[PDB]
Design a protein around this ligand. Structure first.
Ligand code: MV1
Ligand code: MV1
Lengths: 307, 307
């Protein structure tokens, strides 16, 4: 029986790297690396370089596609110094490490001949404010589709891709657990915009941000390991983030491995776990590429959508 | 505020026709034309020719896209005498005339230089059998997503597009109101396959037939007119189809304009009307092109997805 997907294991995938140049320092990789992640330059070579190569084979191609419609509409040929922005979506659960994947991926595409203007945006700033969430009773549902201003989010990506000179996005504070007043992230006609989020790949009764993606990644892993990674790093933050007297969750810092584990499992169970199962996982089937990680965070298997 | 769509009126749309050749006879157009439809060669010129032109600007482009992945995967360059099939979906309510739109569209792309092998398939044969529908209690829900073997339907389009030499599809009898035993529609590596159906554009928790479309059309109209067109042609069939003593609905032939109108409105109200409102219309937002028809069946407005 035929399939739209083709699957590899690093052995295979790492080959397609061809001769793609590794433009990343190990100290540079570390500044993109997040607490918990095991990513090293090897993986960046055997996994991110082929991805980088792949993506570039399509940025030019996906171009000959807007051209076609331009040529159809009887329109000039926009400045090759400003074509249509390439949209990439990175999706996956909390703690799966999609955020590092996105940061790394940006660093790569960024330092790639030309001088590509690769921008990265997380759907975080598109969360309604704690006060707005309280009004809607969603304070315990952050991460769920309805806790985001998907209306605003669409205008953003739509704007950018439709060739605008600048689009603004709100900013979220993880320390203060809320959207920052006045904060603005301005994105000016990138060449490639990477949108990172949980349900970014979701679909609905209306054109959504995923309908604008030209390529998408879905970092994956057994729901059982993610919980581990989630909990494990809840504890780990007792001495990093929660340590700041300014943190909203500074109270978690004094917890014990035990108390913390209870706390962590409960949040996972009541929030992130459900959200992953009923919202994020059902989008996995339509991601250009899935990055399957082993319990050790190692990406040892991939799934590409050929169709 | 920017939009993914650009809208035209025939005046504008008909221009993009450029110099596309009209290879259709009025007698030929008539054999594609269905009871109720007002389509004439003019419309075929001012509306279908630009569409034909547009589509061809992308068939070649959407190609440079599978190529990219082929070049990435380190694969040869398949016979240019068998590339990847172009998939087009035509969607819309019952009686809107999407079926003629699909037939016409095939005739055009068919007679277009080269010798394109343009195949047309309706999701009809993918309906479970009356006996299977009875088992699931769906005999009064034909047309609804769950009255179709979408599993089988996907394997079909997936198969074809993944470069198979032949895929088989069941056949539906409108006269006998059921799937025909043993009937087979064999489609052999087309160049362009057109899939016509109601929810073909629908989306779900799994990769669907719409995720394989390279271009899609959605024939549209006010829900109030469609009802008119629906009813109006229920009556009209009393003397055409229902006239056959072999028809399942031969009983409708003797009805009176009145009885028939009641019968028609009831079916519309209890079946097609709901289905259109809760299933077909919510897919309209993501069709490459929408064909908006006026109460006179005239397509006097269009909406193209540029993004
Ligand atoms: C309570 C902090 C524990 C942090 C350890 C894991 C990383 C943060 C995940 N946060 C939680 O799972 C608690 C509920 N808070 C949310 O879902 C939102 O803020 C997220 C999903 C982070 C916005 O993207
Ligand atoms: C009852 C026949 C009246 C025919 C006049 C309109 C054209 C046929 C529409 N049929 C009806 O609306 C009755 C319920 N039958 C169905 O939805 C399925 O067979 C359809 C939708 C036709 C399969 O595509």
């Amino acid at each position: 029986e035929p399939s739209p997907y083709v699957e590899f294991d690093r052995r295979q995938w790492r080959a397609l790297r061809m001769s793609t140049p590794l433009a990343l320092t190990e100290e540079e990789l570390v500044g993109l690396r997040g607490l918990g992640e095991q990513i090293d330059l090897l993986e960046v070579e055997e996994v991110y370089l082929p991805l980088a190569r792949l993506i570039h084979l399509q940025v030019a191609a996906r171009q000959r596609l807007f051209a076609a419609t331009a040529e159809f509409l009887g329109e000039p040929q926009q400045n090759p110094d400003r074509p249509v922005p390439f949209i990439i979506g990175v999706a996956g659960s909390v703690a799966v490490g999609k955020s590092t994947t996105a940061r790394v991926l940006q660093a790569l595409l960024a330092r790639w001949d030309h001088h590509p203007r690769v921008d990265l945006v997380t759907t975080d700033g598109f969360l309604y404010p704690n006060a707005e969430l309280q009004r809607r009773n969603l304070m315990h549902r952050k991460g769920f589709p309805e806790s985001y201003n998907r209306r605003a989010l669409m205008r953003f990506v739509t704007s950018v891709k439709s060739g605008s000179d600048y689009a603004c996005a709100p900013v979220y504070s993880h320390l203060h657990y809320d959207i920052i007043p006045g904060a603005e992230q301005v994105v000016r006609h990138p060449d490639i915009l990477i949108l990172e989020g949980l349900n970014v790949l979701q679909t609905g009764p209306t054109l959504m941000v995923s309908d604008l993606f030209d390529f998408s990644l879905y970092v994956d892993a057994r729901i059982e390991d993610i919980e581990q990674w989630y909990v494990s790093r809840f504890l780990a933050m007792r001495t990093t983030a929660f340590a700041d007297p300014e943190s909203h969750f500074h109270h978690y810092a004094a917890f014990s491995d035990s108390q913390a584990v209870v706390a962590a499992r409960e949040i996972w169970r009541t929030i992130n776990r459900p959200n992953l199962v009923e919202n994020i996982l059902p989008t996995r089937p339509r991601a250009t590429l899935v990055l399957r990680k082993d319990a050790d965070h190692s990406i040892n298997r991939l799934r590409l959508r050929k169709l």
